[PDB]
């Protein structure tokens, strides 16, 4: 008997230049038992505790500069509060001293939550330009109901 | 649905305590349910069995200072059975490579897998409270998930 | 509890070789040619943490990476991640979870590619497991 879980497993788009867009329609990823993905986030279709997800992966050539910060971010907006705030957040300096050999940066962010029903969650990046997508599953974002 | 009720507990730093580390799951987005405790900074196990230990701190430094820095990011265990600290995680990273002649940033993620026993008390410390940053909710937190 | 699951750990010599003897097997769930098979199609929790370990940087640029990748009941990737770390020592943890439908005979695989950086001291962080949802 398959899981009446609310899940998702949503990978971003290679080919969406500067902006990060999370996909169900690729192998491999999903959305099912009532999670929905609306303008990029994913939408929460009842309350109780999740295990919320997302990986990112930097990578530069060189270090051109001690100053380039990457950051990545889960964020969930409560229909009852109409706000956002962020559940995850990272920020991380790639670069200690200027350079030029390629350099990689993931970032996994995970968690338990408690959500209720109607939540959207998104999950960001400040540099879509600086993601890679070499090989696949090496940028995702997903929810799994306890 | 019916709801879990495997132990499980996600608790963030006060924001509030500028120079501490003092975790809360009495703020918004945290939580401990099915048996964990927060009790004098330190989470307690209710039950037995293999769980996943999660955690991150945020550091940020204007510039790089005289004095080399080190920062230490570590994850102890206290046993009703041996009632002594023994860490079960720990990592470090020096953040500056010269002293400056401009912000950095530096995570430290920590966690894995290990078998708990009841009444555990897990510590998460770190040495550098002057460079952690609260700026944000989200950055700095401490969980635990029953396997 | 009946939901198939595995938690196995790493031994060993220049191999990441997963072993069921702070490890669990149960459910159905079978650890064969390293690699875990799935006793029954549906969705799943895949995850893995490995540690890498060095002492300084040497002058070949090195890639440290690690995969999940399922073998249908062809060999995709499903989770992946890669880290550079460059006489100091250094440690890299690369950390990989997520939720898939899967199918009854499906096997998945969790490897690196640098098993010489791989470390064997704390056993906490060198693991690969499944849940049925
Ligand atoms: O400490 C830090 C800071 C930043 C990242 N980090 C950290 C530390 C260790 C491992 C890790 O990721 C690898 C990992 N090991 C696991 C071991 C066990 C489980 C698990 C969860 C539920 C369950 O019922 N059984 C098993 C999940 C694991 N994951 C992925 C993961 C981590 C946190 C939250 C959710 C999640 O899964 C996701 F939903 F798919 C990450």
């Known amino acids: 008997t ?3 879980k609310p ?3 949503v990978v971003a788009n290679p080919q969406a230049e500067g902006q990060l867009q999370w996909l169900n329609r690729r192998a491999n990823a999903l959305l099912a038992n009532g ?4 303008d990029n986030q994913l939408v929460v279709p009842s309350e109780g505790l999740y295990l919320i997800y997302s990986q990112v992966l930097f990578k530069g050539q060189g270090c051109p500069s001690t100053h380039v910060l990457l950051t990545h971010t889960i964020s969930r907006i409560a229909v009852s509060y ?4 962020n559940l995850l957040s990272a920020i991380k300096s790639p670069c200690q001293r200027e350079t030029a050999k390629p350099w990689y940066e993931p970032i996994y962010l995970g968690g338990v939550f408690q959500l ?3 939540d959207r969650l998104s999950a960001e990046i400040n540099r879509p330009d600086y993601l890679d997508f070499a090989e696949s599953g090496q940028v995702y974002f997903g929810i ?3």
């Open 144 to 146: 799994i109901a306890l």
């Open 116 to 118: 209720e029903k109607g």
């Open 35 to 38: 999670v929905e993905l609306r």
């Open 7 to 9: 899940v998702a497993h």
């Open 82 to 85: 109409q706000t956002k705030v």
């Open 2 to 4: 398959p899981s009446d």
